């Protein structure tokens, strides 16, 4: 996976639109990971630990 700055117009056409959908999935999976941490946040919230 080398430089994409060589063929900016070429790569960023297909490459860019491609990386956006993976980011859409990747970031979504992060939220699920975070969702477990949300539980630890809830004990913060509910206990008023601050």
């Amino acid at each position: 996976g080398p430089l994409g700055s060589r063929r900016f117009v070429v790569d960023d056409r297909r490459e860019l639109q491609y990386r956006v959908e993976v980011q859409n999935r990747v970031y979504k999976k992060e939220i699920q990971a975070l969702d477990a941490e949300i539980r630890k946040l809830e004990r913060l919230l509910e206990s008023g630990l601050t």
Binding site: Q17, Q23, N24, Y27, E37, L44
Partner: protein, 53 residues
Amino acid sequence: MDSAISKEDEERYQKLVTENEQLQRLITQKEEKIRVLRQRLVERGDAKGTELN
């Protein structure tokens, strides 16, 4: 303006970036707050948790 890249490819991309903007923000909200939890877990020694994979 492009003869090959029509509204089709555009809309698909536009909506896609929109998706990206939404949830990357939703992440950051939790992250910044969990980040503090991270430090608090550091003192507990829970910083790593249990990653046997």
